[PDB]
Ligand binder design. Structure first.
Ligand SMILES: [Mn+2]
Ligand SMILES: [Mn+2]
Ligand SMILES: [Mn+2]
Ligand SMILES: [Mn+2]
Lengths: 216, 216
């Protein structure tokens, strides 16, 4: 596992970083990147290697500034995953909203300093997620982790996250994949090494933050 | 392009079929399958080859029976894509809701004849879509197309759909994909041929339906 400071540096450089939550929690690794400059090609990569449900962690301040209400009033998710209503980019170059170009665009726009509610179409294809006010020390999830990195690296308070799945193996000529699942632990590290990314645990992320904030 | 009747047969056999909307519309091809028996391995394949935003077209009757309210009251999507609130399977085998196993499960459950509102957690990771009452002749989209196939093939009135993207090409050792996009026209047919699937146009789907119903 890389050291948090080095993860921060990569993050600040516009790179994806691989982040693992606790084993007792989701025991999942997400690809987490700053939203402000996520490129079309990077988004293509993200879509290719993840679940494809591209989310955009952001602060409460941002949800209000941008008028992104919670998808549901009585949240039935066991983790309280804070989904807002979905969105597309209101931009002349947007078409159907699902292509890597469109989704990357929506992400950058949500992060733009001049962002306004009218900049987004609801519903759409990118999923903003409301990080809790107390950040990672309060809720140990990738949503908080992405916003925390943004803060740590001095970026716009909008990240992009998605889970790294195990797409199993191709079956020549058949519309199935054998033995799929979710990438875990060591396989996540290996995944990171393969693509030149830094990889860490939210747990170490918390330890980092505690250095300045103390234990919640 | 395959003949509708043959597409129907494949569909009835639990296969994915490749469906293209009009060029003047989305000009996209979706992987469309019956939800009632979508397998874990098939879902893995679907996730791997599509946008990863796995939707589940269903009837108004089903949205009411299962208490799936529209995600938004004032739908800003230019196509009026009918998203309901998202869901996960309330099942002991569900974990985080995003794995191919979990998503496939949610799909089958939404299609179960004994399905009840309490069977699903909201919000979640599968996206039900409300087909319009008039079906394909009324709205020429993949949502209607999936529900129509269900009807045509005598299946439960719940389909699973997702767009087939162009993930561009791998870039050895780099977290990017070059020249990504959406698969179109001939490339979609080729995609279908590659995986042993039938492929058709919603336009021919409409022509099929018109044989019995006349032009809307
Ligand atoms: Mn669409
Ligand atoms: Mn997570
Ligand atoms: Mn999750
Ligand atoms: Mn479509």
């Amino acid at each position: 596992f890389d050291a948090i400071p080095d993860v921060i540096q990569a993050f600040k450089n516009g790179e994806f970083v691989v982040v693992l939550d606790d084993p007792s929690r989701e025991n999942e690794a997400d690809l987490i990147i700053a939203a402000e400059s996520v490129t079309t090609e990077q988004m293509a990569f993200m879509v290719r290697h993840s679940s494809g449900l591209i989310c955009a962690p952001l602060t409460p301040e941002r949800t209000t500034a941008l008028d992104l209400p919670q998808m549901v009033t009585h949240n039935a998710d066991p983790r309280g995953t804070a989904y807002t209503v979905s969105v597309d980019a209101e931009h002349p170059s947007t078409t159907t909203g699902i292509s890597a170009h469109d989704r990357a665009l929506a992400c950058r726009m949500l992060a733009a300093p001049d962002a306004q509610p009218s900049h987004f179409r609801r519903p759409g294809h990118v999923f903003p997620l409301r990080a809790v006010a107390g950040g990672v020390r309060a809720r140990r999830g990738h949503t908080e982790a992405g916003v925390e990195l943004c803060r740590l690296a001095g970026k716009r308070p909008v990240a992009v996250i998605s889970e790294i799945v195990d797409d199993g193996q191709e079956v020549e000529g058949r519309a199935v994949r054998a033995a799929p699942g979710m990438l875990r632990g060591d396989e996540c590290v290996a995944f990171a090494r393969r693509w030149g990314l830094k990889v860490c645990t939210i747990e170490d992320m918390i330890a980092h933050v505690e250095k300045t904030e103390g234990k919640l």
